[PDB]
């Protein structure tokens, strides 16, 4: 496919927690699988797995300027039963969850998006065209 | 006797018989009612409705209980609403407070024709004059109906009605008080339209045909003369934080008698009992230092050393302030920075790269790949066969890991915290302090989860011996000295002590406000403090400050009073001396005849009305023989794992949430315990997720309260709690119906005809965000578990001594009448509590002069510090039982009748400076305030208009602080930047300014800026400043400094410091500059001299002298 | 200082001598409202009547005016079912007359209103009473209650009209064939509305569609005769069935339509219909309903198979079949969308209405959508559209 031009990509770095975590926010609208392939090809990494409130707050401060309300973070619902399991796409364990009001049990899509206003997450459909943040 | 009507919420409602004639011009409704906890949202106690047809509805008055905020359902108040047949609107007036959900309230609602007034407990709490004229004509008199306990749309009410009375004339407030006292008959008055002692309900009232009828019980509504419930302040927690109790502990030195307190040191040994946590030498040295420091303050410590032989616990690190969930996250926590931790799972190591690469596991554990970013080497390092578990397994998911938390150690050991002060040991990498000591008012303070966590490597070190004294003072009710400066949420917190006070800060008058510093002197500049630059007489030598151990050496006497009062209040089990708790308050004088006096005194400071037995349930029994108990064993099903049944340790003890309508960790959620990776399911549709709360002593109940803390904001179903099933010991479940609940007040349920014993309840919910904080069960009036208990006796001593018959007597009740007084003598009374044969310390003496007055006579006597004097000794009205008027109340007459004046409409001379809602902004006599016109801003928008600063500001708007989203309702009164949010301003730094112009260019003595928002973000915890500047007519700028905002400086005043050598300058515009986009400016005022204008008077040439009378040059 | 005369007021001065430094208190009478103003300064009126004025520099600092207190122009809710003639005005002391409508009856002596001192019109001493007359007749329905036949009734009660067996309110389910309803006398003197339309029985099977010429179409007790052993004469029964059934390359395609035949062009074969566009569906369009302007309350009949008729023609003619913009798959994902807010896509699964979205809060996929317009709730089952 085509790598996104750098005029539509911003860099988010300088978290008050870690000092090695760097993220790249692409404002181009893409689906979940296309965002996964775009991050894995053009920037050599999966989508962002959020593990703490500092990363999520810096991500919210970066994405609050966008016109779109939702961005992509790499969380999926990989399960079948009475209780499915969330999974990050980079394979890291899911220890931090920052959901909105009535979010995980209210059905929806099988992908995880981040609301740009408030920073709270939201279950969203995977065919939605949204901006996406890659770790690299 | 007195008789009462119980209305449940099932639709039981009455109407008046049609032979009676309803009032038209004026009326007065007086009703004694005992409301229950959870109510319907527009609950109606008594209403008058039109039954002609559907024409011009909500005409006629309705009194009831309803929430102020209809879209939130948070604050339920008593209300009275009237709409006459001629008015074009319905006026609703509300009380000044949320309703008390368990007390008898004397509601009165009067209307004469120009003024509708609402009195709660005889104090006028609401008044309005927006309804004028009669209610209805005699032509439409035929189709008006008086409903009791409900409405036509079934707006039903839960609780008791005792003394209904309806009058055809508007009674005055003194007549309201007289009818409150007289519970009998007013039959001599022709204007008494109706009064109802419920001997015959069916004579004058008729029920609805499809509906049922209310139950008829006995009331005992006027059952006490002295209100024995004393409330803590806004910054306090228990009865000891009250001003009068701590004043009697500070003054009388018989309350500070020496005590012996047992404390227990818990050092872990290995299986062969060889390697300790602390040595015996440091245990003895710490005991010597502790007995040295507390010997002056009359507290002795008895040392118990408990050895625990466990090699599994000894080899595992204990983490004081490190949460287990904070190990794998990418930020570097300084608390979890240890070798056995794994350097915070490898998230504090410098060579960590964020690329999570999971390696295939092959053989032995590697230390370079035992971090979080390498999946802890695929679980090889946590295998017991490959390597030792207790030095390699850093994975928090594994059950056998290298570290442990102190609460897990407390659950493992499970000690008896009810009789000793347990000392636990854990490491601390940040080494600022030790672990969190449990406060006396915590629910764990007498459980196994409570005690003091210390660092064992600094225990008994010659330079670190004062940390245990600091934590011991923390466990005895003392805050840090710097609570009112640095331990506050924002600059607008009510507990930020600007002055030494008994109610602000650390509740100690002898500790001046101070910040936190490590130095042994007063601090320098004030870069972090809001309104203070320098501090003087700072308690740097206090034990409670953060000074070095060569600096801290003393306790202030107020701290010693707090420690002794908390030892008497909650820590009676830690002392081997069985001297009972004294009556902390002086005896109160209730009445006198010509030759006798009557005294009533408070219960003792322990709160227990019975003697102490170890193997019984006599510590729960109340003033009668009602066993009030809380939960002991909660059980809820785990949603992901069937038949899991996890036990929530929250929702067990007494309710302990600070914010009553906020999500908290101290409650139970239906899916609180699920892991973040597993999807939390919705609750089952037909019944819902349920909590099973078991009580320790099964009995026959009569009442059940549940402290529901958080409900969903947009719930949109009818009820939150789905049903409550009482679990009986016979196997039967008794299912109560769906319950309406409120966020603030608890949910109180009265139980009818539960013959069998009840050992627990089940609370079912269809809400996935419901939070339950506690549950309390109250038994019947003679519990069989309180029959063996023996009550405390009271012995009254008089300073002119009583006769030998009178003086030796022992009182079961708390009332004492004596008739051996002379007509002018001065007596002093006190009361000693006798439990068995051992007496307590005496209460503070009450001095009674038989000719003069006291605090219950109805005569205001200014020499004895009486602001008001009623005759009630009840704290519900505007005047307290200590002759002190309460906050935002005013009492006028010589028998003091008090009214609520802060939320009034009229302005009086004593409230011009403070009541910004009623009066205007207080400008002094020598000055005048000109507000802005045509204010130009920096960020114009459609949503934020930017012309709202023009004119006088909205003084009735409540100042908001710590607010995340400002887009609710404040855009109609003030300007804030709509375009920029707080995260975007955090990203890109910018400056927002507001330029305001004035019609008349005056000389600015001061600039008054009115705000409705503090400017602080909900999660930033950073104070915000503004930079006001003055702009002259020649476009020069004069800096007025950087000013810190607060909601306690809501008309913010910026004075102009002008040197008299410089000429006075006309100021046209004012530029308010700030950085945070959450600051809302309702108005900017320019304050000038009212008498004269010095710029014009200085321009006057020779021969033209000044004239401030006409403000011109005169010649 | 000059003499200050205030209309409709009593003026007092504590000093007889007038000089610069003397003040006079003016109090306006009952039934008059103060208007304290200044030069380019409209201030709010004083609640009290005591206002003291002081002369400054030979002039007066303000002006004291006291208008008559104005009652509102007589409301419809002040007196119901009446008209108001007030030639005297709406000032204090004015009088107005009210007269009822023709169904309403004026009962009482005096029929006058007066704008009084407190600012409101007085109590009406006579009443306009509304009496509901006899209802208009309903075809194929029968009255039940005998008091509803009378011309006198109260306002707000119900009268039952029962339809014939087979006739019912439209929208009646097949299992619950309720054949009666009620009408209530409303506040305007009329009744509620309801007509028993025939919706019972079924249209003929699609293999013989087109040649039918019924009396009332597909309605109850309508006889359809296909014009040409039995014939094409069938009669619907009371329970909802008939006495029998009927007997005996499309190059005009759409821009995306494809017809796959598993049975070929034989007689009676049913072939699958699809749209080659991925986001398109084949519907039957009415002639007055264009492609771009389908209303949001319209549900077009979706096409599944083409079936042959008795005239050897395809009943779903592909010329009449339009491949229109199909439903995007973001239905039921707690997401209000502009495309699927119509009856063609189940109102986006109810995501645009607050009572029906599972998160109980409406979220638009583009945050810059019209919340009351393009992304608005349009569901009649919701409580926003419902009057309750
Ligand atoms: C500790 O307790 C002793 C009593 O054992 C207190 O000593 C009394 O002090 C008061 C003045 O404060 C004297 O009037 C009494 O005569 C003293 N009694 C005795 C027996 O010495 C002492 O004040 C207490 N100290 C504190 C800090 O509370
Ligand atoms: C030692 O501690 C373990 C927990 O690690 C606990 O299960 C056990 O009961 C304790 N005592 C002994 C004697 O093992
Ligand atoms: C403590 O944290 C620092 C960084 O803050 C880290 O370099 C070090 O490895 C950690 N552990 C120890 C034992 O110092
Ligand atoms: C701990 O590890 C050392 C070397 O890795 C080994 O010699 C020792 O036996 C281990 N201890 C236990 C209890 O397995
Ligand atoms: C409190 O402290 C002040 C000094 O800050 C002192 O003047 C006063 O007497 C103390 N006590 C009370 C009850 O105010
Ligand atoms: C500024 O305030 C902080 C409080 O957080 C304090 O630690 C620091 O010493 C202060 N700076 C100066 C120069 O006093
Ligand atoms: C609490 O209840 C659960 C299940 O009813 C039971 O397993 C547990 O032992 C109980 N605990 C106590 C202390 O009663
Ligand atoms: C009571 O609960 C038990 C299960 O705990 C159930 O089997 C039984 O049917 C219930 N009985 C009633 C009357 O609700
Ligand atoms: C207090 O009340 C009465 C006195 O009228 C008497 O029963 C006894 O003195 C006391 N009763 C109890 C229950 O303590
Ligand atoms: C404010 O000043 C500008 C600049 O002359 C003018 O255009 C505007 O009309 C003024 N608005 C008001 C309300 O005076
Ligand atoms: C005094 O009353 C008359 C009565 O119509 C009114 O026209 C006039 O305006 C009133 N005076 C003032 C100053 O408003
Ligand atoms: Ca960490
Ligand atoms: Ca390995
Ligand atoms: Ca203090
Ligand atoms: Ca709790
Ligand atoms: Ca007195
Ligand atoms: Ca009182
Ligand atoms: Ca007032
Ligand atoms: Zn501390």
mmCIF file of N, CA and C in Angstrom, chain B residues 810-856:
data_model
loop_
_atom_site.group_PDB
_atom_site.id
_atom_site.type_symbol
_atom_site.label_atom_id
_atom_site.label_comp_id
_atom_site.label_asym_id
_atom_site.label_seq_id
_atom_site.Cartn_x
_atom_site.Cartn_y
_atom_site.Cartn_z
ATOM 1 N N UNK B 810 -27.796 6.164 92.398
ATOM 2 C CA UNK B 810 -27.276 5.861 91.071
ATOM 3 C C UNK B 810 -28.434 5.884 90.086
ATOM 4 N N UNK B 811 -28.262 6.598 88.980
ATOM 5 C CA UNK B 811 -29.339 6.831 88.027
ATOM 6 C C UNK B 811 -29.208 5.895 86.835
ATOM 7 N N UNK B 812 -30.308 5.229 86.490
ATOM 8 C CA UNK B 812 -30.345 4.435 85.269
ATOM 9 C C UNK B 812 -30.460 5.320 84.036
ATOM 10 N N UNK B 813 -31.308 6.340 84.093
ATOM 11 C CA UNK B 813 -31.503 7.267 82.991
ATOM 12 C C UNK B 813 -30.660 8.517 83.202
ATOM 13 N N UNK B 814 -30.605 9.350 82.167
ATOM 14 C CA UNK B 814 -29.735 10.517 82.146
ATOM 15 C C UNK B 814 -30.455 11.795 82.556
ATOM 16 N N UNK B 815 -31.397 11.705 83.489
ATOM 17 C CA UNK B 815 -32.165 12.852 83.949
ATOM 18 C C UNK B 815 -32.067 12.935 85.463
ATOM 19 N N UNK B 816 -31.914 14.148 85.989
ATOM 20 C CA UNK B 816 -31.775 14.340 87.430
ATOM 21 C C UNK B 816 -32.513 15.596 87.855
ATOM 22 N N UNK B 817 -33.506 15.438 88.724
ATOM 23 C CA UNK B 817 -34.233 16.554 89.314
ATOM 24 C C UNK B 817 -33.826 16.662 90.775
ATOM 25 N N UNK B 818 -33.476 17.868 91.211
ATOM 26 C CA UNK B 818 -33.247 18.086 92.635
ATOM 27 C C UNK B 818 -34.008 19.315 93.096
ATOM 28 N N UNK B 819 -34.495 19.262 94.336
ATOM 29 C CA UNK B 819 -35.345 20.306 94.893
ATOM 30 C C UNK B 819 -34.817 20.807 96.232
ATOM 31 N N UNK B 820 -33.498 20.820 96.409
ATOM 32 C CA UNK B 820 -32.867 21.314 97.626
ATOM 33 C C UNK B 820 -32.055 22.579 97.363
ATOM 34 N N UNK B 821 -32.574 23.465 96.521
ATOM 35 C CA UNK B 821 -31.881 24.693 96.162
ATOM 36 C C UNK B 821 -32.395 25.866 96.987
ATOM 37 N N UNK B 822 -31.486 26.779 97.316
ATOM 38 C CA UNK B 822 -31.851 28.058 97.901
ATOM 39 C C UNK B 822 -31.973 29.109 96.802
ATOM 40 N N UNK B 823 -32.588 30.241 97.147
ATOM 41 C CA UNK B 823 -33.044 31.199 96.146
ATOM 42 C C UNK B 823 -31.931 32.023 95.511
ATOM 43 N N UNK B 824 -30.712 31.986 96.037
ATOM 44 C CA UNK B 824 -29.660 32.789 95.446
ATOM 45 C C UNK B 824 -28.305 32.120 95.389
ATOM 46 N N UNK B 825 -28.228 30.873 95.843
ATOM 47 C CA UNK B 825 -26.949 30.193 95.945
ATOM 48 C C UNK B 825 -26.442 29.774 94.571
ATOM 49 N N UNK B 826 -25.128 29.589 94.487
ATOM 50 C CA UNK B 826 -24.453 29.165 93.267
ATOM 51 C C UNK B 826 -24.043 27.714 93.451
ATOM 52 N N UNK B 827 -24.502 26.844 92.557
ATOM 53 C CA UNK B 827 -24.192 25.427 92.623
ATOM 54 C C UNK B 827 -23.394 25.027 91.393
ATOM 55 N N UNK B 828 -22.677 23.915 91.504
ATOM 56 C CA UNK B 828 -21.978 23.327 90.372
ATOM 57 C C UNK B 828 -22.254 21.837 90.351
ATOM 58 N N UNK B 829 -22.641 21.323 89.190
ATOM 59 C CA UNK B 829 -22.966 19.913 89.032
ATOM 60 C C UNK B 829 -21.981 19.232 88.093
ATOM 61 N N UNK B 830 -21.704 17.961 88.375
ATOM 62 C CA UNK B 830 -21.032 17.097 87.417
ATOM 63 C C UNK B 830 -21.503 15.672 87.657
ATOM 64 N N UNK B 831 -21.190 14.787 86.717
ATOM 65 C CA UNK B 831 -21.694 13.421 86.741
ATOM 66 C C UNK B 831 -20.541 12.462 86.475
ATOM 67 N N UNK B 832 -20.397 11.453 87.331
ATOM 68 C CA UNK B 832 -19.412 10.395 87.150
ATOM 69 C C UNK B 832 -20.124 9.134 86.683
ATOM 70 N N UNK B 833 -19.550 8.479 85.678
ATOM 71 C CA UNK B 833 -20.118 7.266 85.108
ATOM 72 C C UNK B 833 -19.622 6.063 85.898
ATOM 73 N N UNK B 834 -20.550 5.258 86.400
ATOM 74 C CA UNK B 834 -20.239 4.066 87.173
ATOM 75 C C UNK B 834 -20.651 2.869 86.332
ATOM 76 N N UNK B 835 -19.674 2.081 85.886
ATOM 77 C CA UNK B 835 -19.997 0.905 85.087
ATOM 78 C C UNK B 835 -20.386 -0.270 85.972
ATOM 79 N N UNK B 836 -19.444 -0.757 86.766
ATOM 80 C CA UNK B 836 -19.723 -1.765 87.765
ATOM 81 C C UNK B 836 -19.684 -1.111 89.124
ATOM 82 N N UNK B 837 -18.543 -1.229 89.802
ATOM 83 C CA UNK B 837 -18.238 -0.384 90.942
ATOM 84 C C UNK B 837 -17.197 0.678 90.629
ATOM 85 N N UNK B 838 -16.421 0.501 89.563
ATOM 86 C CA UNK B 838 -15.386 1.456 89.195
ATOM 87 C C UNK B 838 -16.002 2.688 88.547
ATOM 88 N N UNK B 839 -15.612 3.861 89.030
ATOM 89 C CA UNK B 839 -16.118 5.120 88.511
ATOM 90 C C UNK B 839 -15.229 5.628 87.383
ATOM 91 N N UNK B 840 -15.729 6.627 86.675
ATOM 92 C CA UNK B 840 -14.986 7.281 85.615
ATOM 93 C C UNK B 840 -14.475 8.627 86.110
ATOM 94 N N UNK B 841 -13.892 9.395 85.212
ATOM 95 C CA UNK B 841 -13.530 10.762 85.530
ATOM 96 C C UNK B 841 -14.778 11.642 85.516
ATOM 97 N N UNK B 842 -14.796 12.717 86.303
ATOM 98 C CA UNK B 842 -15.963 13.602 86.307
ATOM 99 C C UNK B 842 -16.129 14.367 85.005
ATOM 100 N N UNK B 843 -17.387 14.656 84.684
ATOM 101 C CA UNK B 843 -17.725 15.538 83.585
ATOM 102 C C UNK B 843 -17.344 16.971 83.946
ATOM 103 N N UNK B 844 -17.212 17.861 82.955
ATOM 104 C CA UNK B 844 -17.027 19.281 83.274
ATOM 105 C C UNK B 844 -18.215 19.840 84.039
ATOM 106 N N UNK B 845 -17.922 20.701 85.004
ATOM 107 C CA UNK B 845 -18.945 21.198 85.906
ATOM 108 C C UNK B 845 -19.806 22.244 85.220
ATOM 109 N N UNK B 846 -21.096 22.236 85.542
ATOM 110 C CA UNK B 846 -22.029 23.257 85.089
ATOM 111 C C UNK B 846 -22.388 24.119 86.290
ATOM 112 N N UNK B 847 -22.188 25.425 86.153
ATOM 113 C CA UNK B 847 -22.444 26.377 87.222
ATOM 114 C C UNK B 847 -23.837 26.960 87.038
ATOM 115 N N UNK B 848 -24.695 26.745 88.027
ATOM 116 C CA UNK B 848 -26.082 27.176 87.983
ATOM 117 C C UNK B 848 -26.339 28.126 89.141
ATOM 118 N N UNK B 849 -26.770 29.339 88.820
ATOM 119 C CA UNK B 849 -27.231 30.307 89.804
ATOM 120 C C UNK B 849 -28.750 30.248 89.802
ATOM 121 N N UNK B 850 -29.344 29.990 90.969
ATOM 122 C CA UNK B 850 -30.773 29.695 91.043
ATOM 123 C C UNK B 850 -31.649 30.907 90.739
ATOM 124 N N UNK B 851 -31.106 32.116 90.820
ATOM 125 C CA UNK B 851 -31.881 33.287 90.474
ATOM 126 C C UNK B 851 -31.718 33.705 89.029
ATOM 127 N N UNK B 852 -30.532 33.494 88.470
ATOM 128 C CA UNK B 852 -30.216 33.988 87.140
ATOM 129 C C UNK B 852 -30.567 32.940 86.087
ATOM 130 N N UNK B 853 -30.105 33.164 84.856
ATOM 131 C CA UNK B 853 -30.466 32.346 83.724
ATOM 132 C C UNK B 853 -29.364 31.403 83.267
ATOM 133 N N UNK B 854 -29.702 30.646 82.230
ATOM 134 C CA UNK B 854 -28.861 29.589 81.686
ATOM 135 C C UNK B 854 -29.133 29.517 80.186
ATOM 136 N N UNK B 855 -28.766 28.404 79.552
ATOM 137 C CA UNK B 855 -28.868 28.283 78.103
ATOM 138 C C UNK B 855 -30.130 27.563 77.643
ATOM 139 N N UNK B 856 -31.159 27.514 78.480
ATOM 140 C CA UNK B 856 -32.419 26.910 78.100
ATOM 141 C C UNK B 856 -33.622 27.644 78.654
#
